[PDB]
C-alpha cells in the first residue's frame, strides 16, 4: 500500500551523469522528509543525501558534496538525485528512504520508516563483453572413487550479472555458484562448481549453461574429464 | 560527524539462542538511535528506533536498549528467520550515520573442506592467459587459508577469492580460489599446487597437480 518506487540506475563511464527517481504513494509525500541511502557491494549503508518535506533544506554526504543535488517535486509526489561527475567509488545499490514519524510529527531525523526497492549504479570504463566460458574437468590419481567435483570457469564478461545452470536446471544438488570477483581489467568473472558421485563420469553428461543477457550471450559448455 | 561501532562483527548462534549486539557512538545521540535487520537482495528494515521503541509488526523477541553513547540489541530466542546482518543508525544530527553490521549466522559443528584444484583448460591456453581454481568445499567456521605455490614458490598478489553464503541445508561455507598466470609463466613451471589451513585439519591439506598430462 505505502511504497516507494525506484528508477534511473543503470552503467555509466567515470565523469558522466545520471538521475535516480523515487516516486511515493500511499502516504502523503510533502509531509515527509526524504533521504538517499546508498550500499556498494559487500559493503554496509551509507546516507547519501536528505532534503526536508518542503524541499528548503538539503543535506549531503561530504563524499557527494559539489556532485550530487538533490530535488523533490511535490506534485508528482516523486523525490530525484542528480548525480554528476560520477566515480568508480559511487558504485552501490541506492535506496530512496522515508524517516519515521513518532505519534504523528514528522521530523527528518530519526529511524526510516519504507525503503525503495533499490537501483543499481555503476560506474566504470568498461564495455559490454560476452563471458568466456571453460570447463573445470574432474580429475582422479586412481581409476574409481568416490565423489568428484567439476564447474565452470566464467570469465571476462561485463557487467553483472550473469546466471549459471546445469544440464538445463536438471542438476540442483551440490552445487555452489560463486559471487563474482572484479579483475584489474574491469571484468568481473565467477566459477559454479558441483559434486558428483565418481560413477557419474563418463555415463552421465555435465553441461553449464550461462547465460549473460545485457550481451545476449548464451553458452552450453560440456565438462568432461580429461 | 558521529560515527557508530557495533560489536561484535560476527555471531553465530543458535535457533532459542540469547543474542546480544551493542553499538557505540563517539558523541551523545541522547535516544536517536535505530536497529534495522537486512538479509541478502533485500533493503534493510526497522526494527527499533528512539533506542527503545518497537516497530510496528516486530516481533516482541527484539528488544533494544541503552541512552547517549552505549546501545544494547537483544533478540530474547532467536529463530530461523532472524539469521541476517543488523545496523544500528544514529538520527541524532546529519550526517545520518549507520554502524559497519553485524552478521548473525547459524552455529554448527566444525567441518573439514574437501580440497580440489583444478588446472587450465586447453581452450584458455590459446588465449595467452592461465587460471588456476582451487575448491575448498562444505567447510565450517568461515575461517580458512589458502596460499598458492608453483614449484614450490609462494605466490602473492595473482589470486582472487569468492566465498558462499552458509548452505540452506547444511549451513556450511565454500570457497572458490583464482591464481591467474601468463601462459608464458605458465608453460615454465610444472607443479602447481593449493595449500589449504583450516581448524577442521590437523595438518594443512595441499592438493597439486603438474603441468603437462599428470
Known amino acids: 500500500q505505502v511504497q516507494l518506487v525506484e528508477s534511473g540506475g543503470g552503467v555509466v563511464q567515470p565523469g558522466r551523469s545520471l538521475r535516480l527517481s523515487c516516486a511515493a504513494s500511499?502516504?502523503?509525500?510533502?509531509?515527509?522528509?526524504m533521504h538517499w541511502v546508498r550500499q556498494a557491494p559487500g559493503k554496509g549503508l551509507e546516507w547519501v543525501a536528505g532534503v526536508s518535506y518542503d524541499g528548503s533544506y538539503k543535506y549531503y554526504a561530504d563524499s557527494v558534496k559539489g556532485r550530487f543535488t538533490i530535488s523533490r517535486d511535490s506534485s508528482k509526489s516523486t523525490l530525484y538525485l542528480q548525480m554528476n561527475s560520477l566515480r568508480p567509488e559511487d558504485t552501490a545499490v541506492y535506496y530512496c528512504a522515508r524517516p519515521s514519524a513518532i505519534f504523528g510529527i514528522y521530523i527528518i531525523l530519526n529511524g526510516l520508516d519504507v525503503w525503495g526497492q533499490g537501483t543499481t549504479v555503476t560506474v566504470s570504463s568498461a564495455s559490454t563483453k560476452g563471458p568466456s566460458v571453460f570447463p573445470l574437468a574432474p580429475s582422479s590419481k586412481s581409476t574409481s572413487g568416490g565423489t568428484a567435483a567439476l564447474g565452470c570457469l566464467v570469465k571476462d564478461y561485463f557487467p553483472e550479472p550473469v546466471t549459471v545452470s546445469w544440464n538445463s536446471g536438471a542438476l540442483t544438488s551440490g552445487v555452489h555458484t560463486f559471487p563474482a570477483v572484479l579483475q584489474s581489467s574491469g571484468l568481473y568473472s565467477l566459477s559454479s562448481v558441483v559434486t558428483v558421485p565418481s560413477s557419474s563420469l563418463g555415463t552421465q553428461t555435465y553441461i553449464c549453461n550461462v547465460n549473460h543477457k545485457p550481451s545476449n550471450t548464451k553458452v552450453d559448455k560440456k565438462v568432461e574429464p580429461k | 560527524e558521529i560515527v557508530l561501532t557495533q560489536s561484535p562483527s560476527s555471531v553465530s548462534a543458535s535457533v532459542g539462542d540469547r543474542v546480544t549486539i551493542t553499538c557505540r557512538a563517539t558523541?551523545?545521540?541522547?535516544?536517536?538511535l535505530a536497529w534495522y535487520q537486512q538479509k541478502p537482495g533485500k533493503p534493510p528494515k526497522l526494527l527499533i528506533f528512539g533506542a527503545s521503541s518497537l516497530q510496528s509488526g516486530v516481533p516482541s523477541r527484539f528488544s533494544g536498549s541503552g541512552s547517549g553513547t552505549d546501545f544494547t540489541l537483544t533478540i530474547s530466542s532467536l529463530q530461523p528467520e532472524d539469521f541476517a546482518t543488523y545496523f544500528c543508525?544514529?538520527?541524532?544530527?546529519?550526517?545520518?550515520?549507520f554502524g559497519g553490521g553485524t552478521k548473525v549466522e547459524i552455529k554448527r559443528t566444525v567441518a573439514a573442506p574437501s580440497v580440489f584444484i583444478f588446472p587450465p583448460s586447453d581452450e584458455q591456453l590459446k588465449s595467452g592467459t592461465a587460471s588456476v581454481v582451487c575448491l575448498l568445499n562444505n567447510f565450517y567456521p568461515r575461517e580458512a587459508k589458502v596460499q598458492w605455490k608453483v614449484d614450490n614458490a609462494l605466490q602473492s598478489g595473482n589470486s582472487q577469492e569468492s566465498v558462499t553464503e552458509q548452505d540452506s541445508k547444511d549451513s556450511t561455507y565454500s570457497l572458490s580460489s583464482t591464481l591467474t598466470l601468463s601462459k608464458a609463466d605458465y608453460e615454465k613451471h610444472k607443479v602447481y599446487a593449493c595449500e589449504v589451513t583450516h581448524q577442521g585439519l590437523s595438518s594443512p591439506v595441499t592438493k597439486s597437480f603438474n603441468r603437462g598430462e599428470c
Open positions: 500511499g502516504f502523503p509525500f510533502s509531509s515527509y522528509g
Open positions: 543508525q544514529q538520527a541524532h544530527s546529519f550526517p545520518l550515520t
Open positions: 558523541q551523545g545521540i541522547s535516544s536517536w
